[PDB]
């Protein structure tokens, strides 16, 4: 049972929950790989038994009446057909648990308040699109954002797979150039290639909302233009730096992740887009400033008249703070839910305390919980964390092509 | 077989083949990563020594030669006769450099080959120990033009207690527990402060009182030694454009000299081997001055800057901290005292990483320690995956002598 210390306060806890870890991670006694982004059939019954036992424990109803019964149906469902269907409530409780189990999510204090849309009866790219569009419009909610996940049909053998070919529902275009460099978002350069490939007309913009590429089983993808009124965007302005607006920067309101495999009770949902709301540093620091993303940092420094000639002026840090100020100021003026890294990390500590008494600990990935600016000014920095894999879970999956 | 490591900034990919020769085991398992935790007989002595001698003879391009085999047998014979062996001087210099080179939490290792090794293995008493330390401080400080130095005191050996420096660093500020539970000075140094007083140090009552040294010779109690004032180069903190900042009375010292770690070379253990380099500005400005459990000056600075400290979304904390780091860099450069900012340091560590991949097929690095505590993703190390493992020779933590 790992001893885990908070260095700001001196407190000690033990992660007893870690002993239940499922799909082992990438680290061995001889070398730690925690910093790596992507870690280097009849036993479906084991993962179904486990999840069902989880479900009935969470309603103070283990070993009573319906618990026994539900074990036999999945036994019979898999005995007969090889796979099984989740009761609607189980799908809800498992979608919530997988968010609860996400070691890299700093937003998990909200895990109990998640809206699960059941799309298990979906059948093709036009049906998906309307599900995706209901999610987007529900989640966006005129800027009063609400956590949502739409669960598309589970995978079963011998037939294809529902997939969203975009990493998120809202992505900006990346346009390669006559000289390799990129106008727009370089993280998306490739899905821009596929959208252009399958018929989309490339704009000329740094911020062109990409179309969607939705794929029904066995059929090739099909482009879907997103309703421009459904794609809520925030222009970025700064409260005191009047020229910031003139940089023509924008970001979207809705972080909706559409490429992760949701895995509940041994079942695989390669299409289950989830969404919450942004922490400002995701936008201001990673998306706008990462050297391989919009990479705007030096442009804002010039505008601030900072000495970019020596790094000891800390011009990078100064411009990065003002970018984050602009992001928070703009989303607030636009009345769009956003949370700064201090409020977010403080609520994560509160979540750690809740999880400690509730489940005996909490899988947390220190490198992803600690914000990408001002790390040690937030409490999570001083909190030792234990990383491990519990089920239900969100897992990465290979790109469909 | 070998970990594939990606740099996300450039897209680059390497394989850390060096990780496969990891001489000891870390705290992680396939169940669970513990990489964020701060504190994770003749046969094995023989095989560690044999491995180190092989390393040493590789570096001087004498692998498998006559000199090499003679030294193995010499060591095996001395381990059989005495239960221990003695390093030649050149092996010691190589072993201290390697230990620095192998330290995964150290972002300053581009410099590892330029290390000044003082051989104090003939030290006899605490008084001689103090003189060796004063000359280390004098040489490393070098009037503000800092040089990397390690002074190696006699190895652990059977029959004798250890040389130990009780202080975690050669220069530390006292932490005076006051009666509220509040601390005047550095709260990290409350324990060593009480020990110094208990050993007869007359306390001051400032916030930057330099602590005396508690020096332990084999099988003796610790002995108190006052550092001569003109040997502890200090830097008053001022800000280039916030002039009220100098009225905070803040200071820090020039020399970061870690004195409580164990240097291990070929199975031999040196519990006393203080090493020193020069500061990276975020250690002082962010960690030592802004940590809530250290000097915790963040709020007072933000208030003086007239930031709105009632809401977090004004980012007053980030704004105050940036300016504290500016003050640190300005103050040291004004005082002509070596200092590196987290941008210059992380960039040189990237060059270290590339040098080490070519030299050894990888480099042990502890990402959470290499990434600076502010502005993390603005530095290049953030976007570099890293492999953490224990190579030997090594610096290791050890329990406090008390
Ligand atoms: C509601 C407020 C939320 C906040 C503030 C938030 C914030 C974050 C942040 C900053 C990360 C770091 C990962 C990255 O940026 O690459 C993350 C990871 C993650 N979050 Fe959340 N999130 C929220 C909601 C949700 C919801 C509703 C779900 C799913 C139901 C979710 C699932 C995940 C997963 C699976 C990851 C890890 C994926 C990865 O590392 O790429 N989050 N979250
Ligand atoms: C000369 C410039 C140097 C710089 C800029 C530098 C920088 C750093 C920094 C920022 C850390 C993390 C400190 C912390 O917050 O815990 C560190 C750790 C460390 N350094 Fe270096 N260092 C330098 C020289 C040296 C030398 C000369 C040695 C030994 C010969 C050394 C050995 C270590 C070790 C063993 C650690 C790990 C201890 C720990 O992480 O608690 N460093 N270094
Ligand atoms: C470098 N970084 C920009 C990578 C972007 C990225 C890639 C992923 F796969 C991923 F799951 C997330 C999660 C972001 C997220 C999800 C839900 C709410 C929220 N507020 N945020 C973010
Ligand atoms: C409080 N927290 C910052 C940790 C303090 C701490 C504890 C250690 F054991 C340790 F080796 C170092 C390294 C500090 C250092 C050494 C050499 C040069 C440099 N520039 N810095 C720092
Ligand atoms: C608990 C957490 O891992 C701990 O505070 C670590 C994080 N990274 C660090 N990095 C450095 N350079 N120094 C530190 O003391 C720490 N502390
Ligand atoms: C190498 C390092 O692990 C990698 O850059 C990680 C660190 N933390 C991150 N944190 C977030 N939110 N997103 C990322 O892409 C990363 N990348
Ligand atoms: Cl994002
Ligand atoms: Cl320090
Ligand atoms: Gd101007
Ligand atoms: Gd001024
Ligand atoms: Zn690990």
Tab-separated table of C-alpha atoms in Angstrom, chain A residues 64 93 155 226 261 294 339 342-343 345 364 385:
chain	number	residue	atom	x	y	z
A	64	UNK	CA	-29.280	-8.842	-2.570
A	93	UNK	CA	-22.907	4.340	-14.057
A	155	UNK	CA	-18.261	-3.226	-31.045
A	226	UNK	CA	-21.167	21.423	-38.721
A	261	UNK	CA	-12.537	4.101	-26.816
A	294	UNK	CA	-0.347	27.903	-33.003
A	339	UNK	CA	-12.063	27.451	-15.238
A	342	UNK	CA	-5.881	27.484	-9.762
A	343	UNK	CA	-9.602	26.872	-9.245
A	345	UNK	CA	-6.397	22.217	-9.199
A	364	UNK	CA	-3.816	10.421	-10.751
A	385	UNK	CA	0.085	10.802	-6.703
